[PDB]
Ligand binder design. Structure first.
Ligand SMILES: OC[C@H]1O[C@H](O[C@H]2[C@H](O)[C@@H](O)[C@H](O)O[C@@H]2CO)[C@H](O)[C@@H](O)[C@@H]1O
Ligand SMILES: OC[C@H]1O[C@@H](O)[C@H](O)[C@@H](O)[C@@H]1O
Ligand SMILES: OC[C@H]1O[C@H](O)[C@H](O)[C@@H](O)[C@@H]1O
Length: 490
């Protein structure tokens, strides 16, 4: 039955639906919008549960009231929810139209210890996320950063227990860095970065620097230092000593640094996912993380932007599959945040390959046998964008004999706004939803299309780093159709 080819569609709620004062501002306004989504056949919505808003007053001073009111409304409108444990700041990234800092009390600590923030070679501290360097440092009034995230999720679980039991919350997204993605803040607009700048390494805080020097010493090279020839945010790879042909990134020193730099993210993600598994154990929900889609410079040997962001991906080294393997022990979903783009839409000098990047990442996920989800990176309302998303959702088309051999677990659309609801735009969107659903009407029971959710089980045993890095072995991607068989048209 066609229903087996059905891929659910979710929509992101506006940023700031509950303001920085922890007040659910416009319920009536949101209700009307939500009801229109319900009529269009949308399966559910996604929302940020901001750490900076809930634990503002002080350590363990949680106020969940406004968010309970929001969840209540969403449930009344017949929609499911994907909740993001947003441990990051809203404001310094593309599209951020509102400012939501991390808890003020954490910022107060940062005043007397600036090293809790990601730092670039120039000494600039980024305050949108806590460096991975303090994950296990008990400097936050007795707690470590990971313990803070852990307590936050447990409190969420207990205070929203009634919504979890009623099946409202379907996915639990755990923020792992800037914009909630597992990556370093290598391309900060707030510091002047501009597409397609290569970005900068963000490992200069005293904690990461100390770890690196200890590590190089154990490797027999205590003289080794952090990169000093990688350039600046807006540089191009060829104008740097680190990323040029036969440059530093290809030397033993460079490869050691790059492995070290990227391994820190794998462990950061693995440890926090461990805490997430414990906090939601037994609940009927799935865990998920977000991986950023850095398509610029993907078409040159150095993959500069990817490397500075923490994804050690080269033509001969798969820097994404090991993340997929790490997610398997947690039975988690890998969400790729950039699926609507086409190569021909990028300036030629950016050397972008978003289409090839998507195929690499999704194939790696299916290869490791984990579920893969996604979102569009930029606001799009045209058919060609929707058709590109539909192609990646079922790379080899629909199957009339049963389920597709390959299909994404779901797609979340960015974002809910008045432009989307504009008559003509919404008209196209409704066709998009219909095609994602494979021409079938909205289906309320996820079980009908093999999307039933079982109680979350404890994570499988810890996979050693050496076994994780075995997944760096390059593999051929799965075959992709040139265009989807379920077009929206135009
Ligand atoms: O509300 C979700 C997050 O939205 C933004 O980040 C987006 C980014 O704009 C988009 O290109 C990509 O596809 O997904 C990320 C994360 O979903 C905000 O900057 C974040 O603060 C929000 O968490
Ligand atoms: O953040 C920089 C952004 O600039 C915009 O003008 C482009 O259209 C986006 O593709 C790009 O991501
Ligand atoms: O990090 C913010 C955004 O940057 C750009 C990437 O293409 C997108 O996937 C990401 O979400």
């Amino acid at each position: 039955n066609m229903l087996l080819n059905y891929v659910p569609v979710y929509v992101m709620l506006p940023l700031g639906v509950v303001n920085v004062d922890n007040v659910f501002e416009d319920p009536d306004g949101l209700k009307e919008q939500l009801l229109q989504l319900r009529a269009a056949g949308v399966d559910g919505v996604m929302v940020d549960v901001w750490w900076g808003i809930i634990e503002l007053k002080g350590p363990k001073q949680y106020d969940w009231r406004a968010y309970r009111s929001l969840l209540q409304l969403v449930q009344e409108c017949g929609l499911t929810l994907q909740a993001i444990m947003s441990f990051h700041q809203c404001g310094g990234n593309v599209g951020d139209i509102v400012n939501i800092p991390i808890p003020q009390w954490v910022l107060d600590i940062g005043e007397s210890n600036h090293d809790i923030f990601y730092t670039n070679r120039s000494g600039t501290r980024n305050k949108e996320y806590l460096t991975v360097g303090v994950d296990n440092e008990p400097i936050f009034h007795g707690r470590t950063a990971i313990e803070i995230y852990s307590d936050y999720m447990k409190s969420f679980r207990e205070n929203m227990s009634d919504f979890l039991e009623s099946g409202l919350i379907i996915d639990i997204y755990v923020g792992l860095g800037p914009a909630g993605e597992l990556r370093y803040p290598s391309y900060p607009q707030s510091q002047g970065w501009e597409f397609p700048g290569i970005g900068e390494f963000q490992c200069y805080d005293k904690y990461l620097k100390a770890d690196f020097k200890a590590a190089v010493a154990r490797a027999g090279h205590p003289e080794w230092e952090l990169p000093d020839d990688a350039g600046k945010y807006n540089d191009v790879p060829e104008s740097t000593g680190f990323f040029k042909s036969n440059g530093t990134y290809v030397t033993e020193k460079g490869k050691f640094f790059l492995t070290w730099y990227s391994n820190k993210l794998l462990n950061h993600g693995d440890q926090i996912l461990d805490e997430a598994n414990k906090a939601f154990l037994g609940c009927k929900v799935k865990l998920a993380i977000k991986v950023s889609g850095i398509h610029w410079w993907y078409k040159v040997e150095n993959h500069a932007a990817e490397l500075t962001a923490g994804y050690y991906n080269l033509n001969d080294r798969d820097g994404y599959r090991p993340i997929a393997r790490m997610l398997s022990r947690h039975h988690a979903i890998l969400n790729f945040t950039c699926l609507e783009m086409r190569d021909s839409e990028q300036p030629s000098d950016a050397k972008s390959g978003p289409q090839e990047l998507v195929q690499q990442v999704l194939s790696g996920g299916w290869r490791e046998d984990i579920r893969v989800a996604g979102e569009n990176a930029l606001p799009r309302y045209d058919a060609t964008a929707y058709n590109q998303i539909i192609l990646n959702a079922r790379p080899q088309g629909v199957n009339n004999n049963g389920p597709p051999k390959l299909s994404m677990f779901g797609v979340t659309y960015l974002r809910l706004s008045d432009d989307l609801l504009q008559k003509s735009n919404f008209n196209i969107f409704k066709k998009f939803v219909l095609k994602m659903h494979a021409d079938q009407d909205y289906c309320a029971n996820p079980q009908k299309y093999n999307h039933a959710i079982t109680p979350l089980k404890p994570s499988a045993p810890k996979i050693p780093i050496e076994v994780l890095l075995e997944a760096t072995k390059p593999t051929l991607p799965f075959p992709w159709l040139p265009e989807t068989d379920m077009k929206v048209d135009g």
